[PDB]
Amino acid sequence: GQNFLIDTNILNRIVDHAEVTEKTGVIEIGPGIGALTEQLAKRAKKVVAFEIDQRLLPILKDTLSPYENVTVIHQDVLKADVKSVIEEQFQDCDEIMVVANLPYYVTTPIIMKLLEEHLPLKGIVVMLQKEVAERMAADPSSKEYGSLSIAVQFYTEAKTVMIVPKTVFVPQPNVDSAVIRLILRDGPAVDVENESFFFQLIKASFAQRRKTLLNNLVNNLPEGKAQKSTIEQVLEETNIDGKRRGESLSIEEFAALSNGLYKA
Amino acid sequence: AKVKATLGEFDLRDYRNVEVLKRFLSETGKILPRRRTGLSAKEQRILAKTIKRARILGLLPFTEKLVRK
Amino acid sequence: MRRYEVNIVLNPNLDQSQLALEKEIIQRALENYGARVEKVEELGLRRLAYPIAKDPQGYFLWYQVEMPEDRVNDLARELRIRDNVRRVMVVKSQEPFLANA
Amino acid sequence: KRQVASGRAYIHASYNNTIVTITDPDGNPITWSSGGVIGYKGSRKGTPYAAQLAALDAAKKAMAYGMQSVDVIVRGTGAGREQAIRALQASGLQVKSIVDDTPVPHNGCRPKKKFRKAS
Amino acid sequence: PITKEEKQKVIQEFARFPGDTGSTEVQVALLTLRINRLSEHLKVHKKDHHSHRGLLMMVGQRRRLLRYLQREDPERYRALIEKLGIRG
RNA sequence: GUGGGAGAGGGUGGUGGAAUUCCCGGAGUAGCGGUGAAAUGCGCAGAUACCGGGAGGAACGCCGAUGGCGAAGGCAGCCACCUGGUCCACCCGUGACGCUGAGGCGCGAAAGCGUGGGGAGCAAACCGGAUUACCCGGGUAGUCCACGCCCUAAACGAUGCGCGCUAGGUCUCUGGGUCUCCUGGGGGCCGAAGCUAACGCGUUAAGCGCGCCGCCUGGGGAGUACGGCCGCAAGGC
């Protein structure tokens, strides 16, 4: 058992932040002990629970007698397809939400891959660390800025809904927990030639952050390893980008840079 | 019994007095500490310098192998 | 014009001819670099605790010289060019500091 | 096969494992033995008993080549050096000398994370 | 190094009277010689930071001695500075 | 000034061996490696043990010290050159030429950075594995060099510098003398008087005095905001 939140107050506040109403639908990831599930199911039209824990599921399953919307599906969210779930279990409520209070070493890759899964859902609200929360919801020219902020910029505009004290968690974490909201955008924030190529670019830029954009792109890029001799024209193709870094630049800057990269 | 005890009269800056120099090295080609040699630090320091110099000349072993289990 | 000692260790696997020519050439270099030898000690063959240049044996030669200080490096680099010599170590002449007098 | 009649037995006594190799004076390795070839896996590979068995196995499989006398040098600081040497000498080959030649760096390369913090 | 020969020669040259080894002029001359040698050394050896501190202290000492000399007697000061070509 | 002494103080060239990793061979059979226990991983394209030859980079095992040097940061193979600081002795020269120091100038561990080299080993990030539901296998920048930036620390003795006076005992490093001992300088441990809220300090004062400098005025807000200065930037004052 990980650090489990025991406060009804902050749980009520978070489930309010989730806007769990009659129309609103809920996806449960790692139902666990079943406090979040308790506060969600009563106000949700249909709750679908995904978990791979052996015994953390069927014990909770006993308590799910008063709830009629608890369609618990025993599987790993990463391994198992979720596309079918939209058709099968959201016939009751087309609106989609994902809520999680899990440990973060499992939570963050789950969120990343879910966004990679390309399932069109309205939004997601998850529980994460303060540092990673800053990392996701970041502005240009910040120490808390990086590739993760760039990645989440395509999908959503984020803000920590309500900072959480460490006390509420049973064992106490040393670092403060901060719950963020991720509400999916209409589409891509800024257009690009290739999505994968864009991601490769952003990885290359922020690989050795401290170095200049030029020094990053010289050594980081694999195709850059190919065209090391050719990086002259790469310098040429730069527009209004002088002696610069990654963190300095913004989403539109990197998008234009990628669009230029395809033309090289 | 200190190594100094089982010796007579000699010079330390003489980096060619090889026969006396083998005495100050252990069963392994290591320089014995002051506890075993029985010299003052100044003497120990100058002797270590001379020993290293002779090692460079190849008159003395940098390391050896010990006949024991 | 300080007093230095010069050490040359060279190939033992040489007869009188190569030995003599090496001696004369190194003496030529010595007198070339503004040096002035006083005394020469010849040590012949000595066993080495470790093999140098794939050879467990070595031939030894000893000089003490008073010569210009600025040119000792030049002499050391000169004597080391030949493949017949293994180690050349020039050290300053040190006073016999005795023990337990 | 060779019948050198006089070789040398190398004992590589690491922490995790002990290796025994018998070879001619020319360094040509005739054969070898370890804790692994006996069948021991994992932790018990470097146990003193494994060292004993490895020494005996190497000696036995070396007797086929007609080896009678060896001159042993031991390498590594593993737990089963003494056990290996005693087993080898009590196997049937008259050891001339017993020596260590454990390789020690002269403050060379930077070691692993765990092996650091040297006094 | 500054051998005995040239050191003694400078001492003899700048001595006020025979048997003077410690007067202001002699001190200034010796400091100037040391300063010159160290200056050329640091010119050749740019990244020898430890010696530069010594150079600074020597320059300071010479400056203080010259200040005292000028205070007590300006004519000797002018004569010494023209003899040694200090401050230009 | 003269006559000596010790020292990983600094800069520049040269080269000594032991490892580690690769390459080229000879022999070698089924594992090697790893852990609390394991897995990943390598190995039948013959691994690991081992013998020989070669390449390359980095760091100097015993000596080694509770040691030494430096104004700090720091400085360990060896050889040579160019240099900085310092101690003792002779009392030989000068006649107060001294102390401190707002700004200025310079130095400044480690980590960063620009422009070029180098890359053995270790190793941020990262790719893997696994269990206690940190640890092992790989690996990038970086750690290495030249030039130019950055100017930060538990940059600590948490103790600014200089000088004088105030019991001693003991262990060390380095000198001098007439050498069981006297006399200087440096580094530790007990402890008179004294001081301190106490812990403790105590001839290397946190004692008794003098001179100069730098800072403090309840805790947060906050080393934050604004403004200014310095940097390519991160950032610094």
XYZ file of C-alpha atoms (C1' of nucleotides) in Angstrom, chain F:
237
model
C 73.485 41.734 3.656
C 76.139 37.206 4.643
C 76.227 31.527 5.750
C 72.988 27.623 5.873
C 67.807 24.404 6.191
C 63.101 21.900 5.222
C 58.879 21.512 2.150
C 52.458 17.306 -2.492
C 53.940 26.035 -3.166
C 53.435 27.379 -8.756
C 54.650 27.209 -14.219
C 57.165 24.499 -18.612
C 59.120 20.175 -21.120
C 60.659 14.878 -20.658
C 59.121 9.757 -19.211
C 58.600 5.153 -15.262
C 55.717 0.894 -13.688
C 51.121 -1.542 -11.871
C 46.015 -1.818 -13.114
C 41.384 -1.238 -16.548
C 39.532 -1.433 -21.683
C 40.186 -2.747 -26.880
C 43.117 -5.057 -31.236
C 46.313 -9.147 -33.147
C 47.705 -14.239 -32.232
C 48.304 -19.613 -29.228
C 45.580 -23.030 -26.397
C 40.973 -23.710 -23.956
C 35.657 -26.202 -22.884
C 30.476 -24.703 -21.391
C 29.609 -21.371 -18.695
C 30.832 -16.246 -17.382
C 29.205 -12.213 -14.821
C 25.864 -10.271 -10.938
C 22.813 -10.274 -5.943
C 20.248 -10.375 0.424
C 18.303 -13.887 -3.241
C 17.954 -12.999 -8.289
C 17.007 -11.229 -13.090
C 18.844 -8.166 -17.409
C 23.404 -9.128 -19.857
C 27.540 -11.602 -22.382
C 29.085 -16.993 -24.476
C 28.971 -22.520 -29.149
C 30.312 -16.186 -34.724
C 34.468 -20.929 -28.760
C 32.926 -16.841 -23.896
C 35.334 -16.635 -18.477
C 40.689 -18.605 -16.358
C 45.493 -18.122 -18.617
C 50.519 -16.823 -22.264
C 52.746 -13.321 -25.657
C 52.827 -8.799 -28.864
C 50.465 -3.876 -29.841
C 47.240 0.720 -29.106
C 45.054 4.328 -26.135
C 43.429 7.426 -22.059
C 43.341 8.512 -16.994
C 45.413 8.273 -12.119
C 50.016 7.789 -9.104
C 49.848 1.471 -4.878
C 53.650 0.749 -0.122
C 56.448 5.270 1.795
C 51.870 8.028 4.339
C 51.841 10.441 9.198
C 47.003 12.768 14.312
C 53.090 14.698 8.577
C 54.530 19.080 5.277
C 53.735 23.646 1.916
C 50.434 27.966 0.695
C 46.978 34.195 1.827
C 42.777 31.391 0.734
C 40.641 27.843 -3.167
C 44.124 23.823 -2.913
C 48.862 20.878 -3.618
C 51.122 13.564 -3.784
C 55.227 8.777 -9.395
C 60.116 10.350 -11.071
C 63.761 13.836 -13.754
C 65.519 18.684 -15.201
C 64.793 24.185 -15.902
C 62.323 29.116 -14.472
C 60.260 31.036 -10.079
C 56.957 32.453 -5.012
C 56.842 32.221 0.282
C 59.423 31.043 4.913
C 62.950 29.558 9.369
C 67.759 29.790 12.037
C 72.766 31.864 12.817
C 76.317 36.148 12.461
C 74.452 41.023 14.877
C 77.212 43.162 9.630
C 74.396 47.927 7.097
C 69.551 52.048 7.147
C 67.522 55.123 11.106
C 60.642 54.770 12.169
C 61.381 53.723 6.222
C 55.346 50.947 10.352
C 49.776 48.842 11.088
C 45.099 48.634 8.912
C 42.619 49.589 4.697
C 36.228 52.418 1.766
C 36.608 51.881 -3.745
C 40.232 49.684 -7.594
C 43.150 45.416 -9.351
C 44.147 40.101 -9.053
C 43.311 34.886 -7.430
C 39.277 31.803 -6.520
C 37.068 23.819 -5.114
C 33.325 21.491 -7.613
C 29.355 22.019 -11.386
C 27.966 24.796 -15.773
C 29.290 27.581 -20.944
C 31.737 29.438 -25.949
C 35.621 27.845 -29.551
C 38.813 23.564 -30.880
C 41.071 18.744 -29.431
C 40.706 13.918 -26.534
C 37.716 9.992 -24.466
C 40.628 4.118 -21.065
C 37.573 3.929 -16.544
C 33.459 6.136 -13.858
C 28.996 8.329 -14.690
C 23.761 13.318 -14.546
C 19.982 12.618 -18.143
C 18.516 8.096 -20.627
C 17.633 2.155 -22.218
C 16.954 -1.923 -19.437
C 16.041 -5.560 -15.571
C 14.309 -7.085 -10.941
C 12.817 -7.757 -5.907
C 11.516 -5.131 0.493
C 4.838 -5.970 -2.665
C 17.079 1.470 -2.941
C 20.072 -2.403 -6.041
C 22.579 -5.006 -10.748
C 23.381 -4.804 -16.322
C 24.429 -0.782 -20.432
C 25.124 4.385 -21.745
C 25.083 10.381 -23.383
C 26.856 15.078 -21.924
C 30.595 15.600 -18.071
C 35.007 14.217 -15.631
C 41.046 14.940 -19.424
C 43.993 19.399 -22.513
C 44.676 24.809 -24.885
C 42.472 29.642 -24.928
C 38.248 32.678 -23.097
C 33.873 33.115 -19.632
C 31.229 31.905 -15.034
C 32.872 34.010 -9.400
C 29.397 30.107 -6.136
C 29.581 26.993 -1.179
C 28.962 23.756 5.774
C 34.552 28.935 0.431
C 34.399 26.484 8.489
C 38.652 27.141 13.065
C 31.111 28.602 11.604
C 36.581 32.612 15.299
C 39.446 39.801 10.301
C 44.447 41.693 10.545
C 48.966 43.614 13.410
C 51.524 44.272 18.064
C 52.406 43.800 23.545
C 51.515 41.172 28.664
C 49.446 36.668 31.548
C 51.543 29.158 35.250
C 52.836 25.058 33.262
C 52.750 19.556 31.528
C 52.981 16.254 27.207
C 53.497 14.495 21.705
C 55.334 15.841 17.108
C 57.996 18.702 12.266
C 62.210 21.733 11.357
C 66.880 24.677 12.610
C 71.221 26.526 16.047
C 74.504 25.791 20.392
C 78.903 24.366 24.628
C 74.086 18.511 22.751
C 71.077 14.200 30.172
C 69.846 19.842 28.221
C 69.310 25.287 26.508
C 67.418 28.324 22.530
C 63.986 29.813 17.943
C 59.844 28.881 14.439
C 55.178 25.409 13.011
C 51.439 21.791 14.151
C 48.164 18.858 18.069
C 46.239 17.171 23.464
C 45.477 18.350 28.903
C 45.197 22.295 31.965
C 46.941 28.231 36.348
C 44.802 32.951 36.493
C 41.080 34.765 33.716
C 36.555 34.754 30.433
C 31.594 32.737 29.018
C 24.170 31.838 29.297
C 26.382 27.261 29.094
C 29.093 24.095 26.021
C 33.796 25.362 26.369
C 38.508 28.810 25.219
C 42.974 29.082 27.623
C 51.125 31.732 25.196
C 48.094 28.719 17.731
C 42.772 32.706 23.674
C 36.840 32.815 22.908
C 42.037 36.142 28.726
C 44.028 41.477 29.695
C 44.804 46.045 26.185
C 45.590 49.360 21.764
C 44.836 50.874 16.216
C 42.107 50.081 11.607
C 38.362 47.619 8.704
C 33.631 44.584 7.669
C 28.837 43.591 9.611
C 23.862 43.092 13.663
C 19.275 45.567 15.669
C 12.451 40.220 16.700
C 10.367 35.778 13.216
C 8.190 35.378 8.593
C 7.009 38.064 3.969
C 12.402 37.583 1.550
C 17.619 37.154 -0.400
C 11.464 38.237 -2.844
C 9.735 42.887 -5.894
C 11.379 47.400 -8.276
C 15.768 50.026 -9.950
C 20.946 49.681 -11.085
C 25.718 46.950 -12.456
C 28.141 42.320 -14.472
C 27.513 37.797 -17.852
C 26.349 33.936 -24.312
C 23.241 31.795 -20.902
C 22.138 29.391 -16.276
C 22.931 33.010 -12.954
C 25.919 36.689 -9.745
C 26.188 41.730 -6.634
